[PDB]
From a paper:
The hinge amplifies small local structural and chemical changes to achieve large global changes while the chemical environment for most residues remains similar throughout the conformational change, avoiding the need for global unfolding.
We solved crystal structures for two designs, cs207 and cs074. For example, cs074 (site pair 1) showed a clear peak between 40 and 50 Å in absence of the peptide, and a peak between 30 and 40 Å in presence of the peptide, and both peaks agree well with the corresponding simulations (top row). To increase both the absolute distance from N- to C- terminus and the change in termini distance between the two conformational states, we took advantage of the extensibility of repeat proteins and extended hinges cs074, cs221, and cs201 by 1-2 helices on their N and C termini, yielding cs074F, cs221F, and cs201F, respectively (first column). For hinges cs074F and cs221F the distance between the label sites is above the R0 of the dye pair in state X and below R0 in state Y, and hence, acceptor emission upon donor excitation increases upon addition of the corresponding peptides cs074B and cs221B, respectively (second column). FP based titrations and kinetic characterization using the unlabeled extended hinge cs074F in excess over the TAMRA-labeled peptide cs074B agree well with the corresponding FRET experiments, further supporting the pre-equilibrium model.
Author numbering:
A (entry chain A): 2 to 230
B (entry chain B): 239 to 261
Amino acid sequence: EEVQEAVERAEELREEAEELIKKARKTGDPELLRKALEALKEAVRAVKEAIKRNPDNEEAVKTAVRLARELLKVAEELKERAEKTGDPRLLLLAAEAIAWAIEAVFLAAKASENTEGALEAARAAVKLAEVAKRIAKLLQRDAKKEGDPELLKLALRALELAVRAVELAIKENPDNEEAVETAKRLAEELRKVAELLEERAKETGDPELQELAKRAKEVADRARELAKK
Amino acid sequence: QEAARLLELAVEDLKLVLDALEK
């Protein structure tokens, strides 16, 4: 019953995000792709709430697979529009659409007891982690070259989802050194962004720059816990 | 469940797109 309502509510948001992509393809607003992304993310939270308390529900497993395909459609167009504009911001949104696609495929593969694809989803999360790190390395250059405080926040957000990516692969297999090394690589990159945030904060004050400079070091602690363990 | 091979291409597609931003 409750699982049925969560699956239905998840399908309501997927078809709604499906029409936003078709509208976004017609020379659409990147916000239309973000609105489709936000709708799909909440839909993934619905099937997660549905797979929990009732796994192996083929309707919930099928719905989780349909979300992963629709999440890649947002990621597909976000990569294309990021290659035209050259904006690393769209590369961040594209990496988020893949991240939730990794979760959606990891939920269904683990629920259907498909160790074949469940371990494959964990390996792709490690590959996505090194992408979000390079995306963060790119947002650090444009935040220094073009001088934008927003780009340093997005650089941290790129590393925060990169830590969540290796957190998914470590939970499945803690003895994966490529995910362990990447966690060590993300930890040191988080301290670089934290030094960038604190320096610019000392020059301009501002509570946000100080708060995110503290959050960057605290995310580096979680990634350091993932690395040493 | 073939999305497992489809997603690893998406993370690899973003690799080449990210690396293509140099030009």
